[PDB]
Design a binder for this molecule. Structure first.
Ligand SMILES: *[C@@H]1O[C@H](CO)[C@@H](O)[C@H](O)[C@H]1NC(C)=O
Ligand SMILES: *[C@@H]1O[C@H](CO)[C@@H](O)[C@H](O)[C@H]1NC(C)=O
Ligand SMILES: N[C@@H](CCC(=O)O)C(=O)O
Ligand SMILES: N[C@@H](CCC(=O)O)C(=O)O
Ligand SMILES: [Mg+2]
Ligand SMILES: [Mg+2]
Ligand SMILES: [Mg+2]
Lengths: 439, 438
């Protein structure tokens, strides 16, 4: 399997979903699907460039250069574990950024903790991961769904819904979030018509059946609480197309969906009215400058880039598509920054600041790695990381609590019709530390 | 480093048994385990060792090939089990794995083993989840999935015309998957569940207290309590019943975690009295006791845990506070592990898979030939998925498409057989849909 290498005195690992998860037919081979941009190439590229900026910043880790080993998770548990094994055999991997998904992160954490390797996630939101007896070497730069689910329960109350349906994605994210939503909503007098679950990669038939099952609760249960992966919502949408059910349901979705266009593209009419929750994360300015200048002929250090470029533009590079890649192709056309970019970048910084701090205490008057950090002791790195206190890429303070969690907040999107045949995500409200505010 | 039981051979098979109890909150992070276990540890270790000896002595099965083993301690814990499982894969190669016992532990081990093409055969992991061959391709078992045990438990509730029961399951894949099967089966059968609860087996005294208090508030409408539970969870409850004195007000309908296990009820019998349990049908293995009971701490070094076990079992110290008398013997208070036959069938399955492979790849030869050097794990899987032989008790062992085996349950009753005497009474049976009591 392909890997992205950056040399250094210290090597940080990372798992990003450079390709989609395998299909039912190629699962056991663990042959992954198509190359991903926002969730893959962009995060890979973020990783490499953040490391450059840190290595160029003399305030942070002076005379030490951070290198990395970036690996493909395919958003899949087998693939991520396989790849995590490559991290632990046995120059060492000091800590790992990612992976994206709660149940995948858990599987990864189960391996890493046996090797005292701190792991810092940027999108794994499940409450389960707050348990430090079970997941001691796991931390994250996002809040847990104790709050997200709370926000979803609060949106239901605000709009005066007492009767809803529930769908969650199979696996720890959906399962655990929906548990929280089911519990909170029962105390607050909200009835759940039925709770359904489905895997994001189920066939059209499974989704069709789920859609028919949801119609049986019409007209009372037209709102569907979806603690769902983006690809589960898309499945629901496409099933609505096949069954001609556009305008029957209002989907209330969690962060798997947020403001993701790949979820709704091609299926806007069936999604319109949708309410989604997004974790507050501003664009990082300096990412686009770097990224939109990248060229397939000279971006060798990212070994998936040529594959991605050819996919994006549907062309062959003069280094199977029916055309050749034009010289004037640029990413600035239709560019959309990954909604979680700031989290990725902040996760990478936590690791660096964790390392820098350790260095200051264990190497008090020395420049670089002194014997006491040769080699780095994971248990002390975790102590250092657990006391994370810094200013983020976007100017917020990033701090960890005793559970390895981080404060955050949410934007509430409505997916609106903005005029004939044109739809978009519109910020309509927010949720922060218990307070819902709508426009 | 962790202690291992070794036996040499041309083909090495791995095994996972809970030789010690799980970490006690909190020796958890250091992964230090607790007290040594007899039925679930030492006896299984011993069955593994002796079964291989018996196979190596049988000339109809793998002639000229010596089967060895690497037997490791799981402590019935996901982290320890995974930790030990890495020792199997780094990198003589381990060809197959027997165990571990618990479903969520077996899941963790299967996720690693599938990556290295190493077949896994379980003796006691019963969760429906494990039937999914897309997630768990390299996993098989010699016991039926809890699809049947759940259905059986529902049928027991109906048999006594109960319409309102409480539910408790052990945190983990076994309890959660089995209770879900039970809830989505009883709701259709018109049975109501007052409240569903859950708990870790290693949860403190304080934790079980809270649970029981909650259960007491569910009374007196729900005295019957469906427990898709590990034995220690059941024990946990009984110990909480003692601390409160709520004994004789609950009826516990337990799954195979409890079954006919004395280590669950020992010391808390009157708290348990009345209880009903489901046990997988597994007859005692005659030859096992013959071999086992003859073992001596001075002469049984191949089992590295045995001296620890001997010393713990008899509360004495061996010569190389009180000194161990030479008269001590296991024949006293001996109880054979209830799932013993399943361990033994699992090993024989591995053995038979290896043998069938050997006949097609090494046709006119006795022994490991070049074409099985090394052993293709994908081919071992192929061969084991065609498992069909006659078991130690005499039944036919056969894997379905999902790598599952057929089985059946006995229904136990825990009751007083006179002033201060209590025992498990075989009160019925369940077999392929049909429940029978008398
Ligand atoms: C770090 O964060 C804490 C909050 O826990 C704050 O009190 C402190 O002022 C911050 N940083 C420094 C450098 O003092
Ligand atoms: C299993 O094998 C025995 C003997 O080889 C044979 O008689 C029997 O029909 C087989 N059964 C199945 C279901 O394969
Ligand atoms: N927060 C989700 C992932 C959502 C996403 O980034 O698409 C999880 O914990 O698995
Ligand atoms: N059947 C339980 C284990 C019960 C036991 O053997 O104690 C499981 O699959 O996890
Ligand atoms: Mg620097
Ligand atoms: Mg032989
Ligand atoms: Mg199976």
């Amino acid at each position: 399997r392909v890997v992205a290498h950056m040399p250094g005195d210290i090597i940080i690992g990372a798992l990003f979903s450079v390709h989609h998860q395998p299909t039912v037919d190629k699962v056991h081979e663990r042959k992954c699907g198509a190359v991903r941009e926002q969730y893959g190439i962009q995060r890979v590229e973020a990783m490499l460039h953040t490391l450059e900026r840190i290595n160029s910043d003399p305030t942070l880790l002076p005379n030490i250069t951070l290198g990395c080993e970036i690996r493909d998770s395919c958003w899949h548990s087998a693939v991520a574990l396989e790849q995590s094994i490559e991290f632990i055999r046995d120059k060492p991997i000091v800590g790992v950024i990612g992976p994206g998904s709660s149940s995948v992160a858990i599987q990864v954490q189960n391996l890493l903790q046996l090797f005292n390797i701190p792991q810092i996630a940027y999108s794994a939101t499940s409450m389960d991961l707050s348990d430090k007896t079970l997941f001691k070497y796991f931390m994250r730069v996002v809040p847990s769904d104790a709050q997200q689910a709370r926000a979803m329960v609060d949106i239901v109350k605000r709009y005066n819904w007492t009767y809803v349906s529930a769908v969650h994605t199979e696996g720890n994210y959906g399962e655990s979030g929906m548990e929280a939503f089911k519990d909170m909503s029962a105390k607050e007098g909200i009835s759940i018509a039925h709770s359904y679950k489905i895997y994001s990669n189920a066939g059209e038939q499974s989704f069709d059946k789920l859609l028919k099952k949801l119609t049986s609760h019409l007209p009372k249960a037209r709102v569907v609480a979806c603690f769902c992966e983006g690809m589960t919502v898309r499945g629901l949408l496409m099933a609505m197309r096949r069954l001609g059910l556009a305008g029957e349901f209002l989907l209330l979705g969690s962060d798997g969906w947020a403001d993701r266009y790949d979820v709704t593209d091609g299926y806007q009419r069936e999604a319109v009215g949708g309410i989604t929750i997004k974790l507050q994360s501003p664009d990082v300015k300096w990412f686009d400058d770097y990224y939109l200048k990248l060229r397939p002929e000279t971006n060798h250090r990212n070994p998936w880039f040529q594959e991605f470029w050819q996919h994006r533009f549907q062309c062959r590079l003069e280094g199977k598509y029916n055309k050749t890649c034009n010289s004037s192709l640029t990413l600035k056309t239709h560019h959309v920054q990954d909604s979680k970019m700031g989290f990725v970048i902040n996760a990478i910084y936590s690791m660096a600041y964790g390392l820098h701090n350790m260095q200051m205490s264990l190497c008090p008057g020395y420049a670089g790695l002194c014997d006491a950090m040769k080699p780095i002791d994971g248990r002390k790195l975790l102590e250092s990381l657990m006391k994370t206190n810094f200013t983020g890429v976007s100017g917020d303070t990033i701090l960890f609590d005793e559970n390895g969690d981080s404060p955050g907040r949410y934007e509430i999107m409505n997916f609106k019709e903005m005029g004939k045949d044109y739809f978009d995500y519109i910020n309509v409200g927010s949720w922060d530390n218990g307070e819902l505010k709508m426009d």
